[PDB]
Each structure stands twice: as structure tokens, then as C-alpha cells.
């Protein structure tokens, strides 16, 4: 919407950081729009991905990392708190041992750290959404 998609913001993350994303799918769930959030190690889209979060709305969520160019072990979830046609608020919190993904205030997914969060230099949000808010917290 207001924010360009693909959306790119330089970022740093550590324990206590939160990434907050407000947006809306561009299609009804029957048409299977997607959402992707990638935490990258460099300011280049081809760089490694410490945390890859990909929603196929209405179907599934997959999480992974891309390390030295290669995708690692996929974690697949059928949990689907996102609501057809609705705006969502996505909150990704950096805990000591994992990322925790909140959807509309409800814990919905977690992913244990495979690479230290301090390796992140960039966050990208893309695929079939409009985006009205993006924030990384830097309070701690």
C-alpha cells in the first residue's frame, strides 16, 4: 500500500528485538496469495537467509534457512491463523533460542536459531501483500 513491495530495510537483530509488519493479502485465499519474510545476512537479495518465513495463505507455512547458498531443513506448518480478506499484524520476536511469530496477537509459529540473529543485516518482505507498517525495535 503506502510501503513499496518488495520491501527492504537494513536491520540489526538481537535478543529482545521485535519486527512488526502490518499488511493485507492482495488476493482472496481461494487464489492462494503468498507472503514471504526473509532475514538476510547482507544487503543483497542473493545473500544467505537466517530466517525464511513463507505463508501460502489458506494452506501452509514453511520456514527454513539458506546457508552458503543452499536451503536447509524445511519446517512445514499447517497452522493458519490468517483470515481471508483481512488485514493482519505480524510480530516476529527474537528470543534467546528462537524466533517467535505472533499473528494478530496470537503465538502462531516458532523457529529455533540456526545462525546467530546478530548475523542479520537486512529484512525483506515480499510476494502477494500490501504493506502499511514495518518496524524493527531497537530498545534493548
Mark the segment that binds its own copies (CB under 8 A) among 24-32, 57-65, 88-96, 102-110: 24-32
* Phi (first) and psi of residue 30, to 5 degrees: -55, -30
Rounded Cα–Cα distance for residues 70 and 46 (Å): 11
| Per CB under 8 A, 26 contacts its own copies | yes
Mark the segment that binds its own copies (CB under 8 A) among 14-22, 38-46, 57-65, 115-123: 38-46
Q: Which of 1, 110, 128, 132 binds its own copies (CB under 8 A)?
A: 128
Q: Which of 80, 127, 132, 137 binds its own copies (CB under 8 A)?
A: 127
Q: Is the alpha carbon torsion for 98, 104, 57, 10 positive or negative?
A: negative
| Per CB under 8 A, 34 contacts its own copies | yes
The residues of the shown chain that bind its own copies, judged by CB under 8 A, are 6, 26-28, 30-31, 34, 38, 45-46, 69, 126-128
Amino acid at each position: 500500500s503506502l510501503l513499496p513491495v518488495p520491501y527492504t530495510e537494513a536491520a540489526s537483530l538481537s535478543t529482545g528485538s521485535t519486527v512488526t509488519i502490518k499488511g493485507r493479502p492482495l488476493a482472496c485465499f481461494l487464489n492462494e496469495p503468498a507472503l514471504q519474510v526473509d532475514f538476510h545476512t547482507e544487503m543483497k537479495e542473493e545473500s544467505d537467509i537466517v530466517f525464511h518465513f513463507q505463508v501460502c495463505f489458506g494452506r501452509r507455512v514453511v520456514m527454513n534457512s539458506r546457508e552458503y547458498g543452499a536451503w536447509k531443513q524445511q519446517v512445514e506448518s499447517k497452522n493458519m491463523p490468517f483470515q481471508d480478506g483481512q488485514e493482519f499484524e505480524l510480530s516476529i520476536s527474537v528470543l534467546p533460542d528462537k524466533y517467535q511469530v505472533m499473528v494478530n496477537g496470537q503465538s502462531s509459529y516458532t523457529f529455533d536459531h540456526r545462525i546467530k540473529p546478530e548475523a542479520v543485516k537486512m529484512v525483506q518482505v515480499w510476494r502477494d501483500i500490501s504493506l502499511t507498517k514495518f518496524n524493527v525495535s531497537y530498545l534493548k
